[PDB]
């Protein structure tokens, strides 16, 4: 939806096999620039759905998940996210 956002996704595409990851990363960056840490964490948790060849975004998402898990208090979930 929205060709204005489709163009912004296309100009960033070129290194990933799924534009969903890049779109989620862009929306997460926008939400981080706006504010709301709870919404930022929710968006970071939702973004993990489509993988791509760019392993840097996946590693950043896994690190954020591990940070949220160790901040909330889920040792098993943190261990699972680390073994992933």
């Amino acid at each position: 939806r929205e060709d204005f956002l489709e163009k912004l996704i296309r100009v960033e595409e070129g290194e990933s096999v799924s534009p969903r990851l890049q779109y989620y990363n862009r929306v997460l960056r926008l939400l981080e620039d706006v504010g709301l840490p709870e919404l930022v964490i929710q968006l970071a948790t939702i973004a993990i759905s489509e993988a791509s060849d760019d392993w840097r975004s996946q590693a950043a998402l896994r690190t954020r998940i591990f940070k949220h898990h160790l901040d909330m208090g889920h040792n098993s979930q943190a261990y699972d996210a680390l073994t992933q």
Partner: protein, 326 residues
């Protein structure tokens, strides 16, 4: 936000799923301990809580789980009856919830090894809120995203249809009245719905755009407390529809309003849900500065107790309680 007379969490209760909705008893829903019902994502728990400031043999806070049941899609709103016996005489808990399946799920039990679940065809869109619109409990009014508020009963039939100028944000019910209902609108046209005949008797125009939430005062039908923009407004009906009182609450935009279920002068509000630490501000009448500030990592839930001036705020799997000095 505000930082006048600030304090952390006095009573912290840890849970399991994420807490996003929490309410107390609306009127006569139990005269034996603080009865609460909270549902995370796939688990709804009914609890009876007693505090040390109410009794004496309580070590801070004592909570007892009465019924924990796993439900399907998560809920976002629950209806409470103003006249139902749960722990005084004969137990009778009949409550509806607005889950994610676009249909209302009403559970009725009596603590007699039985619990009937019924499905009500509400609105096809995302149901926002719902509440009982009868002092005896026979009709439930719900509002969502369809601009049409349909009065539903215990069976699932349409009683009355009300037109709105925006998706129904919140609904408020007056227990100490005569079928008095309010529907918060984005445009600001609040219709004092009198369900005795299902007709528009009076309408108020909230001049503070945008308008968030609004409710009555539990001890005075004339006092109407609402939140809009950055300041809280107190209206005196039906004497004046223009803002009788308007006083700031936070440095930014507020969220919702909730009058105290014990007094008629103190209340609590909350600005942005988090950002720079959620500071729930307990204010008093004719007081621009908050008489109390409660610190929390994030804000998600607000209610008022009926026995003592107590407020509860949900966050990251935790519930923080606070008490007012007044």
């Amino acid at each position: 936000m505000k930082q006048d007379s600030a304090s952390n969490a006095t009573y912290t209760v840890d849970c399991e799923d994420y807490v996003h909705v929490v309410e107390f008893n609306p009127f006569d829903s139990g005269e034996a301990g603080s009865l609460l019902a909270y549902g995370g994502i796939s688990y709804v728990v009914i609890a009876s809580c007693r505090f040390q400031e109410e009794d004496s043999t309580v070590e801070g806070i004592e909570f007892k789980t009465l019924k924990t049941f796993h439900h399907g899609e998560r809920v976002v709103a629950i209806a409470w009856s103003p006249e139902t016996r749960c722990d005084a005489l004969l137990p009778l808990l009949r409550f509806a919830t607005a889950a994610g399946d676009k249909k209302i799920r009403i559970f009725t039990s009596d603590f007699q090894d039985k619990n009937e679940y019924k499905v009500i065809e509400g609105h096809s869109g995302y149901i926002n809120d719902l509440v009982f619109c009868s002092p005896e409990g026979t009709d439930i009014a719900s509002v969502g995203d369809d601009h049409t508020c349909r009065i539903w009963d215990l069976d699932g039939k349409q009683i009355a249809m009300f037109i709105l100028r925006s998706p129904g944000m919140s609904v408020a019910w007056h227990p100490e009245g005569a079928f008095k209902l309010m529907v918060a609108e984005k445009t600001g046209t609040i219709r004092f719905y009198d369900l005795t005949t299902h007709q528009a008797i009076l309408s108020l125009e909230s001049v503070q755009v945008p308008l968030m939430s609004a409710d009555w005062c539990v001890r005075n039908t004339l006092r109407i407390g609402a939140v809009a923009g950055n300041d809280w407004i107190i209206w005196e009906m039906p004497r004046s529809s223009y803002p009788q009182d308007n006083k700031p609450a936070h440095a930014d935009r507020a969220r919702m309003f909730r009058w105290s279920k014990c007094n008629e002068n103190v209340f609590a509000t909350t600005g942005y849900p988090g950002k720079m630490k959620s500071q729930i501000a307990i204010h008093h009448l004719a007081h621009p500065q908050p008489i109390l500030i409660g610190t929390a990592p994030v804000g998600s839930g607000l209610s008022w107790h009926r026995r003592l001036p107590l407020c509860v705020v949900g966050g990251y799997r935790k519930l923080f309680f606070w008490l007012t000095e007044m």
